[PDB]
Amino acid sequence: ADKSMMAAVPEWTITNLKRVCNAGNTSCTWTFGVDTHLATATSCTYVVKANANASQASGGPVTCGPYTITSSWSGQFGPNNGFTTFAVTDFSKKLIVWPAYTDVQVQAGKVVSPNQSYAPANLPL
Amino acid sequence: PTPADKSMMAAVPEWTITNLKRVCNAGNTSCTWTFGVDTHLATATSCTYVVKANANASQASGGPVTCGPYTITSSWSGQFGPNNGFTTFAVTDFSKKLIVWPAYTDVQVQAGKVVSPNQSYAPANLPLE
């Protein structure tokens, strides 16, 4: 009866992800790859800017390869639990994933390890 | 040595979003979304989620709103043009550290139509403390 929106494809792996913010936290640069395991991986540089707290700001849309990427941060669970969610959409495939990283994971500017993978969903555009 | 890549998909039944609809007021300054969240492990939770704006509440980000065990936010994107507008919810169960992102096109929900069949989504782990 229900319709699963999960696509029958390999999980997309977000590779070598890191966040580096400048001294004033007015710019944060996220760098990562998107490896679908079905095509050449795409390297992404994704810059978010704000007058203050760029680490908390919503970003995009940015186009990287076949992907349209946005992001948003949530402090809904308090500051120890802040986390950023990306929306990574391949319009041509009508597929989307939402990689979500806590501030704890990224705050030192070190690469997140292990790389994390996510099951894409169909977006019936 | 390098740890193997890690799937964030939890080994749980997909959460089904039931009877989803959106009703907006005449001026589109407030939209009320109603739906259930059925995890298949407990009675489904009936939710009411209101998004307000000075204009275009159907395009506005909303939340956080608490509905039972869930914390819900939403955002809208017209990145692909207005015919392809779509809303994405973030539905988190903090206690379980699980999150899903149901996403509905503007076509699906226009005029208060109920989305059918009900759509299900695989939750991801969110490594909160």
Nearest Cα of chain A lies from the Cα of B103 at a distance, in angstroms, of: 7
Nearest Cα of chain A lies from the Cα of B65 at a distance, in angstroms, of: 9
For residue B39, what are the domain limits?
15-109
Cα dihedral angle (A68, A73, A76, A77), rounded to 10 degrees?
110
What are the tokens at B93? Answer: 């169960």
Please count the other Cβ atoms lying within 10 Å of the Cβ belonging to residue A30.
22
Please identify which residue in the block is written with the tokens 């490594």. Answer: B127
Query: Does residue B54 lie within any of the structural domains?
Result: yes
Query: Does residue B25 lie within any of the structural domains?
Result: yes
How many distinct structural domains can be found in chain A?
1
Please name the residue of chain B whose CA is at the shortest distance from the CA of residue A15.
B5
Query: Does residue A1 lie within any of the structural domains?
Result: no
**Nearest CB partner across the interface for A98, out of B80, B101, B129:** B101
Alpha-carbon separation of residue A97 from A79, A90, A94, A111 (angstroms): 25, 9, 11, 20
What 3-state class would DSSP assign to A62?
strand
Contacts of B10 (CB under 8 A, 6+ apart): B98, B122, B123, B124, B125
Query: Does residue B71 lie within any of the structural domains?
Result: yes
Resolution of the entry in angstroms: 1.2
Query: Does residue A124 lie within any of the structural domains?
Result: no
Q: How far, in Å, CA of B93 to CA of A106, rounded?
A: 22
Q: Do A124 and B117 touch (CB under 8 A)?
A: no
**Nearest CB partner across the interface for B6, out of A5, A104, A116:** A116
Query: Does residue A34 lie within any of the structural domains?
Result: yes
Nearest Cα of chain B lies from the Cα of A113 at a distance, in angstroms, of: 7
Identity of the residue numbered A70: T
Query: Does residue B99 lie within any of the structural domains?
Result: yes
- Do residues B36 and B23 touch, judged by C-beta distance below 8 A? no
Broken C–N links (> 2.5 Å) in chain B, after residues: none
What backbone phi and psi angles, to 5 degrees, belong to A98?
-130, 80
Q: Kind and range of the H or E element at A124?
A: none
Long-range own/partner contacts, residues A45-51 (CB < 8 A, 24 or more apart): A46/A71, A46/A86, A50/A25, A50/A26, A51/A26
Q: Is A84 exposed, middle or buried (0-12, 13-18, 19+ CB in 10 A)?
A: buried
Provide the experimental method for this PDB entry: X-ray
Pairing of strands A3-4, B119-121: parallel
